[PDB]
Design a protein around this nucleic acid. Sequence first.
DNA 1: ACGTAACATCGCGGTAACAC
DNA 2: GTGTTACCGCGATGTTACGT
Lengths: 98, 90
Amino acid sequence: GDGMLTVGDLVIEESTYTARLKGRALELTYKEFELLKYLAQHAGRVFTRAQLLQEVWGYGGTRTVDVHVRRLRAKLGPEYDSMIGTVRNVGYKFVRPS
Amino acid sequence: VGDLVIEESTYTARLKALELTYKEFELLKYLAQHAGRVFTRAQLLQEVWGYDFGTRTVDVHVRRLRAKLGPEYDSMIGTVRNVGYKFVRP
DNA sequence: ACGTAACATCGCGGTAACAC
DNA sequence: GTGTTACCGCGATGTTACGT
């Protein structure tokens, strides 16, 4: 345990730079991994696109978050689709499984 | 050591008899002494090289390293795009 | 022994564009 | 407004040659 994180079946190991789902490795791009990581490092908290851009992208084209959110949800699959919830007129947030 | 034996003071490695350069050996050792962990180029430059160069010598060294291993064990060194490289355990 | 030279490959990822 | 999928420039890595 160095920088390892666990939420439900999602494990996000910064060390080895891998993200798993009860053993199924995720082939995430870099920004897809930094986005999923930041959101899970802050479960339940809704963030805005200008927030997520500043934190994950770094200090216009704000639908990149939405695309990356969709690429993320897509790779998570229907069984884990809902780990990224949407808050109309606010932004996104990681949704803890029960 | 999963088919791979690195001998420290001899500065050699055997993959059941790899002939490696000093930098190729320092890079393989540091990647295998921390197997599974990904290291950046800044990291591997300050740890394995003395220098902080931009340079593409790490990428070149991985390649020379990979070639010696052969298409059997060249997977032992993984690439993590936009991050760096890592040793991969069979 | 090593680190540029220099180009080939290919994946990142941001914009476009429309459905709803 | 957001879900969503193309499309394609660009840039990260691969790779080998060559100069020191």
